[PDB]
Amino acid sequence: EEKEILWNEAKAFIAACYQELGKAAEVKDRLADIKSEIDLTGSYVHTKEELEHGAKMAWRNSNRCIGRLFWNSLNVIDRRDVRTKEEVRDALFHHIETATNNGKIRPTITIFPPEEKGEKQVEIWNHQLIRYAGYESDGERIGDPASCSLTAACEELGWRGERTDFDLLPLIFRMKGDEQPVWYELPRSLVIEVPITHPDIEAFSDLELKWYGVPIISDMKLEVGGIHYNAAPFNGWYMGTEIGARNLADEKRYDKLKKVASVIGIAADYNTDLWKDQALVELNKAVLHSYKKQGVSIVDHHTAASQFKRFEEQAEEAGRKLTGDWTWLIPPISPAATHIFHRSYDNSIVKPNYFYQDKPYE
Amino acid sequence: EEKEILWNEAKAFIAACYQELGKAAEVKDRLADIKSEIDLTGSYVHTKEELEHGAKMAWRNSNRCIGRLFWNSLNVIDRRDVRTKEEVRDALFHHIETATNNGKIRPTITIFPPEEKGEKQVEIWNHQLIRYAGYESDGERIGDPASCSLTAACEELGWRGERTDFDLLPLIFRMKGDEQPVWYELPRSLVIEVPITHPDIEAFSDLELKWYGVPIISDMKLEVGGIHYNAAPFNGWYMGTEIGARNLADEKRYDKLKKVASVIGIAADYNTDLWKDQALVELNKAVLHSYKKQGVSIVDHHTAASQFKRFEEQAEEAGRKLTGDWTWLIPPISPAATHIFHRSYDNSIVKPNYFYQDKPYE
Ligand code: HEM
Ligand code: HEM
Ligand SMILES: N=C(Nc1cccc(COC[C@@H]2C[C@H](OCc3cccc(NC(=N)c4cccs4)c3)CN2)c1)c1cccs1
Ligand SMILES: N=C(Nc1cccc(COC[C@@H]2C[C@H](OCc3cccc(NC(=N)c4cccs4)c3)CN2)c1)c1cccs1
Ligand SMILES: C[C@H](O)[C@H](O)[C@H]1CNc2nc(N)[nH]c(=O)c2N1
Ligand SMILES: C[C@H](O)[C@H](O)[C@H]1CNc2nc(N)[nH]c(=O)c2N1
Ligand SMILES: [Cl-]
Ligand SMILES: [Cl-]
């Protein structure tokens, strides 16, 4: 079954991919080569063109992603050649620097060797390459609560955080053949961060909030024609609400709304005052203003939705079915002000795609 | 099949209902009576206790309703005795007055005779008993665009609106046996309306916005143990966002956000300014403030969600499965600030329940 699952996926992927690249005539021979290779080796190797286009199709099929208009401009870095942890580390450093691009963020994915027989060659522990640590002890909470378990795992391995609210977690990954992951401190010169200020409320800086410029998801498996790239970190730029309405606002994250209410000079006493809503809007305004002021790429939820509308129109024009997850596409600030809220989406899963996988710790 | 569908529903309803009312011992005899009656007459008649509890269970099972905590306090008016249009009209007038209760709104349902063989005894045309007319002609738009088709149907029948933006539609319904519905102008003394002002922005009154106090849904079918009450208008009080974030804000409704932006003194030029979001919050603040100031019942979305949490806890304690429609339960303003956004709901349909039915015009 396992080898048969592989061939079926390979057949479906190669037809669709070559069809899109105008290479339909080459499908027959390529499929022949692939079948022999699966018979001989138990797997097959993608061409660079297949791998690149596979990564792009996977983004295009990501139901939960509002940013999909730009799927075809994904920058694909092929690192299937990596064999050592120094090579992994340096490829990750390189991804951070080239994706960041001095603030003009380039959507990028770095693809490491795929799983062999469900056996990982490189097992990444970080949820994102750049992420803040989190600590909870004796009632005391510091940093990002969502990082508590990885943070504890890093410290078990000899790392120590400074216990500010914004400690950068080190990169941490394990190589096939090692019992323990290794970790490396992020060079601060690689990491752009944005202090959060407000366009007209001077006191807002008293909160001393910041966030990192580039979100680089490093814990998802990219699947392309039956090949499982468990290690394939990718980035885009942020939609403002991810930071203002969730990372900084959620009670189980940085939980800043009451503090926001205070500095913008409103009472946080009555539900009917909609103080949480007002705080959310001002904090979200501050986040967009701060990123733009620093020349770091970001998109507001209105502009992102307008772009997504164009993505929908583009799918229809190309004769491709559109899939989407309504519950994730709607922004968490004023969702009914976007077209998304007022229509429905087929949440069917199409491959290539990005998938969750179990974490290697806990 | 039709008669068999009826008996199966009746059996399931009577068991559950009597079980809830501690009347389990009486199920056997009641079921016997019902079966004879279905055999003799092709239907059966609910007792007042069944009818009342059925209407309450139906509210409790309404997946899309955030207000369900108070299901058991529904005030049920039994008007199965109605035979004339004067009786219908007067029952509807009475419902408006007793539900409104000088502003201390009482959740109420008035239940008219049920369908016989899919044949309606009373066919209500209004979507709500109190609702504003809408007009579109020669590019000119007046009133509520969502009322355009019923408004045109009323005017075909000799009604004429004044063409303000807030014309009250007349009650309009048809009796079994008549080819044409009748219509009656709402007595203005029955209708509470709330002018929309803002707690600290004096200029907000320049917009001259208002809304009616009591939403009375008059176009849904109540189904209880296989009996179809197509005409059974019900009301609660408003959640503020229904008015501030949708009725007054949607582009295809009153579309007031740009005008709101102007009176609150902000530019409506840049998506990144989140002017729509800020306008939404201030308009929603104004709506809550205005209702409270006038002593008309209303709930904000934070308080409603907290109540809904208690409803969830209550279902669990009672050993009842909870059903819900996540996409409707989340409020359209700051949904991620409520617990609802962060969990999921089983959207299974349980009866008794309220259902859509085709409109009798167009
Ligand atoms: C170019 C700018 C992009 C923007 C503004 C954007 C925006 C978003 C947002 C707001 C989410 C929801 C995340 C959350 O609520 O936590 C999301 C989800 C997602 N995006 Fe994008 N995205 C972009 C680029 C990309 C790229 C380059 C990829 C991969 C090649 C990608 C794949 C995904 C996936 C897989 C998810 C779902 C993650 C999950 O299920 O947990 N996106 N995107
Ligand atoms: C007591 C105060 C109540 C509040 C605050 C409340 C709140 C709400 C809200 C906000 C909605 C969504 C409506 C929309 O977006 O257009 C809703 C839907 C609904 N409510 Fe309630 N509700 C209340 C009482 C009731 C009562 C008394 C009933 C019937 C006995 C009821 C049955 C429903 C139904 C059937 C829907 C769904 C309508 C549809 O599918 O279109 N609710 N409720
Ligand atoms: N357990 C792990 N990670 C982990 C640890 C703690 C918490 C979480 C929560 O993650 C699950 C969901 C997944 C989701 O993650 C954040 C996310 C996902 C996708 C896009 C974006 N935002 C962007 N603008 C972009 C980023 C990249 C391109 S665009 C953010 C929220 N939350 C995961 C694993 C490590 C290794 C394997 S699994
Ligand atoms: N076509 C008809 N009506 C009609 C006409 C124009 C537009 C619409 C749109 O209606 C569909 C959905 C249905 C939904 O209606 C508004 C609504 C439904 C339920 C609760 C509330 N809000 C409340 N707080 C409460 C009211 C009562 C108790 S709590 C509001 C929105 N929109 C219907 C019909 C007339 C007769 C039979 S069908
Ligand atoms: C339970 C619910 O499905 C869950 O909280 C989802 C809702 N929609 C979301 N949408 C986005 N974009 N991001 C999220 O983390 C979530 N959380
Ligand atoms: C298409 C989408 O399902 C639709 O616009 C829904 C979304 N959720 C909603 N939720 C509520 N409460 N009311 C609505 O009218 C809608 N509209
Ligand atoms: Cl994030
Ligand atoms: Cl309404």
Residues A199 and A186 in one domain: no
Pocket test for ligand 3, best of A65, A100, A127, A288 (most atoms within 8 A of CB): A127
- Examine residue B100 and state whether it is found in any structural domain, yes or no: yes
In this structure, are residues A14 and A27 in contact, taking their beta carbons and an 8 Å threshold? yes
Residue A288 parent element (H or E) = helix A275-293
Spatial separation of the C-alpha atoms in residues B51 and B57, rounded to whole Å: 10
A193 forms beta bridges with: A212
- Examine residue A351 and state whether it is found in any structural domain, yes or no: no
Specify the residue with its C-alpha closest to ligand 2, atom 27: B236
Q: Quick one: A306 exposed, middle or buried, by C-beta within 10 A (0-12, 13-18, 19+)? A: middle
Taking the Cβ of residue B180 and every Cβ of chain A, the question of whether any pair is shorter than 8 Å is answered with no
Residue B157 has which token pair? Answer: 């029948």
In this structure, are residues B166 and B226 in contact, taking their beta carbons and an 8 Å threshold? no
- Examine residue A13 and state whether it is found in any structural domain, yes or no: yes
The last residue of one of the domains, among A268, A288, A303, is A303
Reference A78, options A68, A91, A59; nearest CA is A91
Which one-letter DSSP state was computed for residue A170? P
Pocket test for ligand 4, best of B217, B300, B307 (most atoms within 8 A of CB): B217
Spatial separation of the C-alpha atoms in residues B141 and B149, rounded to whole Å: 13
Spatial separation of the C-alpha atoms in residues B132 and B161, rounded to whole Å: 10
**Residue entry with tokens 């009796």:** B175
Residues A137 and A253 in one domain: no
For residue A330, which residues of chain B lie inside 8 Å, CB to CB?
A: 335
- Examine residue A169 and state whether it is found in any structural domain, yes or no: yes
Q: Provide DSSP, B94-115.
A: HHHHHHHGGGS---EEEEPPPP
Ligand with the closest atom to the CA of B354: 2
Residues 6+ apart with CB under 8 A from B241: B284, B300, B301, B331, B332, B333
- The finding on whether B315 has its CB within 6 A of some atom of ligand 4 is no
Distance B128 CA to ligand 8 centre (A): 8
For residue B250, which residues of chain A lie inside 8 Å, CB to CB?
A: 336
Spatial separation of the C-alpha atoms in residues A293 and B309, rounded to whole Å: 41
Q: What is the domain count for chain A?
A: 3
Specify the residue with its C-alpha closest to ligand 5, atom 1: B343
Taking the Cβ of residue A250 and every Cβ of chain B, the question of whether any pair is shorter than 8 Å is answered with yes
- Examine residue B341 and state whether it is found in any structural domain, yes or no: no
Calculate ∠ Cα A37-A39-A45, nearest 5°: 25
Residues A248 and A147 in one domain: no
Q: Provide DSSP, A53-77.
A: HHHHHHHHT-TT-TTGGGGGG-EEE
Residues A12 and A44 in one domain: yes
Reduced to 3 states (helix: H, G, I; strand: E, B; else coil), residue A168 is: strand
Calculate ∠ Cα A327-A329-A333, nearest 5°: 90
φ and ψ at B337, to 5 degrees? Answer: -85, 0
In this structure, are residues A60 and A68 in contact, taking their beta carbons and an 8 Å threshold? yes
Spatial separation of the C-alpha atoms in residues A89 and A172, rounded to whole Å: 9
Distance A356 CA to ligand 3 centre (A): 9
- Examine residue A3 and state whether it is found in any structural domain, yes or no: yes
Catalytic (active-site) positions of A:
65, 68, 237, 242
Reference B288, options A327, A270, A310; nearest CA is A270
Nearest to B332 among A276, A278, A336 (CB): A336
In this structure, are residues B165 and B193 in contact, taking their beta carbons and an 8 Å threshold? no
User: A120: distance to nearest CA of chain B, Å?
Assistant: 32
- What b-and-e string marks burial along A184-201, b requiring 16 or more CB atoms within 10 Å of the CB? bebeeebbbbbebbbeeb
Residues B263 and B225 in one domain: no
Handedness of CA B49, B46, B4, B323 (dihedral sign): negative
The reply to whether residue A274 touches residue B289, judged by beta carbons under 8 angstroms, is no
Nearest to A334 among B276, B300, B306 (CB): B276
In this structure, are residues A131 and A143 in contact, taking their beta carbons and an 8 Å threshold? no
Residues B73 and B157 in one domain: no
CA end-to-end span of chain A: 31
φ and ψ at A171, to 5 degrees? Answer: -65, 135
Spatial separation of the C-alpha atoms in residues B220 and B353, rounded to whole Å: 10
Q: For residue A139, what is the domain's CATH number?
A: 3.90.440.10
The reply to whether residue A336 touches residue B284, judged by beta carbons under 8 angstroms, is no
Spatial separation of the C-alpha atoms in residues A300 and B11, rounded to whole Å: 54
Nearest to B281 among A281, A300, A303 (CB): A281
Taking the Cβ of residue A105 and every Cβ of chain B, the question of whether any pair is shorter than 8 Å is answered with no
The reply to whether residue A333 touches residue B334, judged by beta carbons under 8 angstroms, is yes
Which one-letter DSSP state was computed for residue B242? I
**Per the annotation, where are the binding residues of A for heme?**
65
In this structure, are residues A282 and A260 in contact, taking their beta carbons and an 8 Å threshold? yes
Residues B156 and B262 in one domain: no
Specify the residue with its C-alpha closest to ligand 1, atom 22: A67
Q: Provide DSSP, A228-293.
A: EE----EE--EEHHIIIIIITTSTTTT--HHHHHHHTT-----GGGTHHHHHHHHHHHHHHHHHHH
Residues B198 and B182 in one domain: no
- The finding on whether B163 has its CB within 6 A of some atom of ligand 2 is no
In this structure, are residues A173 and A123 in contact, taking their beta carbons and an 8 Å threshold? yes
Nearest to B300 among A274, A303, A332 (CB): A274
Helix axes A2-20, A48-60, angle to 10 degrees: 90
Residues A177 and A139 in one domain: yes
Which one-letter DSSP state was computed for residue A128? B
Residues 6+ apart with CB under 8 A from B53: B17, B20, B21
Q: Residue A249's domain spans which residues?
A: 193-215+238-303
- State the method: X-ray
User: A70: distance to nearest CA of chain B, Å?
Assistant: 20
Taking the Cβ of residue A303 and every Cβ of chain B, the question of whether any pair is shorter than 8 Å is answered with yes
Residues A36 and A89 in one domain: no
Spatial separation of the C-alpha atoms in residues B222 and B111, rounded to whole Å: 9
The reply to whether residue A335 touches residue B335, judged by beta carbons under 8 angstroms, is yes
Residues B74 and B173 in one domain: no
Q: Quick one: A146 exposed, middle or buried, by C-beta within 10 A (0-12, 13-18, 19+)? A: middle
For residue B284, which residues of chain A lie inside 8 Å, CB to CB?
A: 274, 277
- Examine residue A244 and state whether it is found in any structural domain, yes or no: yes
Reference B93, options B191, B212, B213; nearest CA is B191
Residues A7 and A111 in one domain: yes
- Best of A334, A340, A341, A345 to disrupt the B interface (most B CBs within 10 Å) is A334
Reduced to 3 states (helix: H, G, I; strand: E, B; else coil), residue B288 is: helix
Residue B200 has which token pair? Answer: 């600290």
Spatial separation of the C-alpha atoms in residues A54 and A221, rounded to whole Å: 13
Spatial separation of the C-alpha atoms in residues B337 and A271, rounded to whole Å: 11
- Examine residue B336 and state whether it is found in any structural domain, yes or no: no
Q: For residue A14, what is the domain's CATH number?
A: 3.90.340.10
Reduced to 3 states (helix: H, G, I; strand: E, B; else coil), residue B135 is: strand
A334 forms beta bridges with: none
Q: For residue B200, what is the domain's CATH number?
A: 3.90.1230.10
